[PDB]
Design an enzyme around this catalytic site. Structure first.
Site, PDB file in Angstrom:
ATOM      1  N   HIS A   1       0.818  -1.223   0.000  1.00 11.93           N
ATOM      2  CA  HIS A   1       0.000   0.000   0.000  1.00 11.93           C
ATOM      3  C   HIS A   1       0.850   1.271   0.000  1.00 11.93           C
ATOM      4  O   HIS A   1       0.405   2.259  -0.593  1.00 11.93           O
ATOM      5  CB  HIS A   1      -1.078   0.034   1.109  1.00 11.93           C
ATOM      6  CG  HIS A   1      -0.686  -0.570   2.439  1.00 11.93           C
ATOM      7  ND1 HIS A   1      -0.376   0.175   3.568  1.00 11.93           N
ATOM      8  CD2 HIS A   1      -0.589  -1.867   2.813  1.00 11.93           C
ATOM      9  CE1 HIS A   1      -0.126  -0.653   4.576  1.00 11.93           C
ATOM     10  NE2 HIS A   1      -0.218  -1.892   4.131  1.00 11.93           N
TER      11      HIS A   1
ATOM     12  N   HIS B   1       6.095   6.884   6.265  1.00  9.93           N
ATOM     13  CA  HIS B   1       5.624   6.529   4.921  1.00  9.93           C
ATOM     14  C   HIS B   1       4.934   7.740   4.352  1.00  9.93           C
ATOM     15  O   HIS B   1       4.706   8.733   5.050  1.00  9.93           O
ATOM     16  CB  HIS B   1       4.691   5.326   4.979  1.00  9.93           C
ATOM     17  CG  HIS B   1       3.461   5.599   5.791  1.00  9.93           C
ATOM     18  ND1 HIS B   1       3.397   5.403   7.145  1.00  9.93           N
ATOM     19  CD2 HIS B   1       2.277   6.122   5.430  1.00  9.93           C
ATOM     20  CE1 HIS B   1       2.224   5.820   7.589  1.00  9.93           C
ATOM     21  NE2 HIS B   1       1.520   6.257   6.555  1.00  9.93           N
TER      22      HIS B   1
ATOM     23  N   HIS C   1       1.681   9.118   1.456  1.00 11.10           N
ATOM     24  CA  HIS C   1       0.526   8.917   0.613  1.00 11.10           C
ATOM     25  C   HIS C   1       0.678   9.924  -0.535  1.00 11.10           C
ATOM     26  O   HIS C   1       1.084  11.065  -0.284  1.00 11.10           O
ATOM     27  CB  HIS C   1      -0.787   9.196   1.384  1.00 11.10           C
ATOM     28  CG  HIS C   1      -0.913   8.382   2.624  1.00 11.10           C
ATOM     29  ND1 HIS C   1      -1.546   7.165   2.659  1.00 11.10           N
ATOM     30  CD2 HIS C   1      -0.380   8.543   3.861  1.00 11.10           C
ATOM     31  CE1 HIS C   1      -1.459   6.657   3.879  1.00 11.10           C
ATOM     32  NE2 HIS C   1      -0.747   7.478   4.619  1.00 11.10           N
TER      33      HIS C   1
ATOM     34  N   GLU D   1      -3.917  13.268   2.394  1.00 11.72           N
ATOM     35  CA  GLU D   1      -5.041  12.699   3.139  1.00 11.72           C
ATOM     36  C   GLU D   1      -5.787  13.813   3.876  1.00 11.72           C
ATOM     37  O   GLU D   1      -6.957  14.088   3.626  1.00 11.72           O
ATOM     38  CB  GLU D   1      -4.540  11.603   4.068  1.00 11.72           C
ATOM     39  CG  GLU D   1      -3.987  10.422   3.290  1.00 11.72           C
ATOM     40  CD  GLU D   1      -4.041   9.143   4.033  1.00 11.72           C
ATOM     41  OE1 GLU D   1      -3.575   9.117   5.188  1.00 11.72           O
ATOM     42  OE2 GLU D   1      -4.533   8.154   3.441  1.00 11.72           O
TER      43      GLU D   1
ATOM     44  N   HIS E   1       3.787  10.797   6.787  1.00 14.09           N
ATOM     45  CA  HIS E   1       3.355  10.389   8.111  1.00 14.09           C
ATOM     46  C   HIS E   1       4.540   9.777   8.855  1.00 14.09           C
ATOM     47  O   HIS E   1       5.010   8.717   8.471  1.00 14.09           O
ATOM     48  CB  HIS E   1       2.223   9.387   8.051  1.00 14.09           C
ATOM     49  CG  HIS E   1       0.951   9.985   7.581  1.00 14.09           C
ATOM     50  ND1 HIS E   1      -0.108   9.258   7.045  1.00 14.09           N
ATOM     51  CD2 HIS E   1       0.596  11.290   7.477  1.00 14.09           C
ATOM     52  CE1 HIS E   1      -1.069  10.082   6.724  1.00 14.09           C
ATOM     53  NE2 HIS E   1      -0.675  11.328   6.969  1.00 14.09           N
TER      54      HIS E   1
ATOM     55  N   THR F   1      -5.116   5.855   9.141  1.00 13.03           N
ATOM     56  CA  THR F   1      -5.851   6.109   7.906  1.00 13.03           C
ATOM     57  C   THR F   1      -5.886   4.913   6.976  1.00 13.03           C
ATOM     58  O   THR F   1      -6.445   5.005   5.897  1.00 13.03           O
ATOM     59  CB  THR F   1      -5.318   7.337   7.153  1.00 13.03           C
ATOM     60  OG1 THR F   1      -4.042   7.019   6.613  1.00 13.03           O
ATOM     61  CG2 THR F   1      -5.209   8.575   8.046  1.00 13.03           C
TER      62      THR F   1
HETATM   63 ZN    ZN Z   1      -0.248   7.245   6.634  1.00 11.70          ZN
END
Ligand code: ZN
Length: 257
Positions: A61, A91, A93, A103, A116, A195
């Site tokens: 992911h 990590h 997004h 996010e 994050h 999340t």
């Molecule tokens: Zn995250």
């Protein structure tokens, strides 16, 4: 088999993870005009000088840069937090296009990506215990905009070819996460969740106001990763972000006027 596709994306997660529709889900839109300045919020203390990065992993992911969290080496304290929170991994997004990927949003604005830095409360002894507690995690969220390159990101970008596909890992020692922090530590904070599944409501979110800039070449490299394993059909790892969730009975606090 949750993910970010049409058939298994955020709108489906509630079937396996009913907490997806809970009372303190993340991310959220940060309405800057309605956030309340809280003059009693303390400056954040980010203490990353002794950080020990270990490895980078494509988990299907995102990619995680993992740290040694068996001692107080890289810790977050202060701000809204009580006690000491150890860095376990960071990590990102990101989007398929520069106009989406974050996010959290700010007055409905989406950034190209969001970093994050995940920390767990040492009073609970390990990460797995911490995620079961309402004050178990502190996640530092940092927006990415596309513009100038971020030199402190380049070591990450250059290893991505070695972890293209799900389940691949690579040694990633001596990476300094201080090179990912903006100049200002002004922030918004609110109680929320992971999340990604399992979406546990264990996070004190600390979202920095100031974005960092990365280059178009750097974000393009993020978008060449794969969700799939090697020898599976290639699906680019893009748009691995959950959209804003209802704020419900929460107030976002600001550290700054
Ligand atoms: Zn995250």
């Amino acid at each position: 088999h949750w993910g970010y596709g049409k058939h298994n994306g955020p709108e489906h997660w509630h079937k396996d993870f009913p907490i997806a529709k809970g009372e303190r889900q993340s991310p959220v839109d940060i309405d800057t005009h309605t956030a309340k300045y809280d003059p009693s919020l303390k400056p954040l203390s980010v203490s990353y000088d002794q950080a020990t990065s270990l490895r980078i992993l494509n988990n299907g992911h995102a990619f995680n840069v993992e740290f040694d969290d068996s001692q107080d080496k890289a810790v977050l304290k202060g701000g809204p937090l009580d006690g000491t929170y150890r860095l376990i991994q960071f990590h990102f997004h990101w989007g398929s296009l520069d106009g989406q990927g974050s996010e959290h949003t700010v007055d409905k604005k989406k950034y190209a990506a969001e970093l994050h830095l995940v920390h767990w409360n040492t009073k609970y002894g390990d990460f797995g215990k911490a995620v079961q507690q309402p004050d178990g995690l502190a996640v530092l969220g940092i927006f990415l905009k596309v513009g100038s390159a971020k030199p402190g990101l380049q070591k990450v970008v250059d290893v991505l070819d070695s972890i293209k596909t799900k389940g691949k890992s690579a040694d990633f020692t001596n990476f300094d996460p201080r090179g990912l922090l903006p100049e200002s530590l002004d922030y918004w904070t609110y109680p929320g969740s992971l999340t990604t599944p399992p979406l546990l409501e264990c996070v004190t979110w600390i979202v920095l106001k100031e974005p960092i800039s990365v280059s178009s070449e750097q974000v393009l490299k993020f978008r060449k990763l794969n969700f799939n394993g090697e020898g599976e059909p290639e699906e680019l790892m893009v748009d691995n972000w959950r959209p804003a969730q209802p704020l419900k009975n929460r107030q976002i606090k600001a550290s700054f006027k």
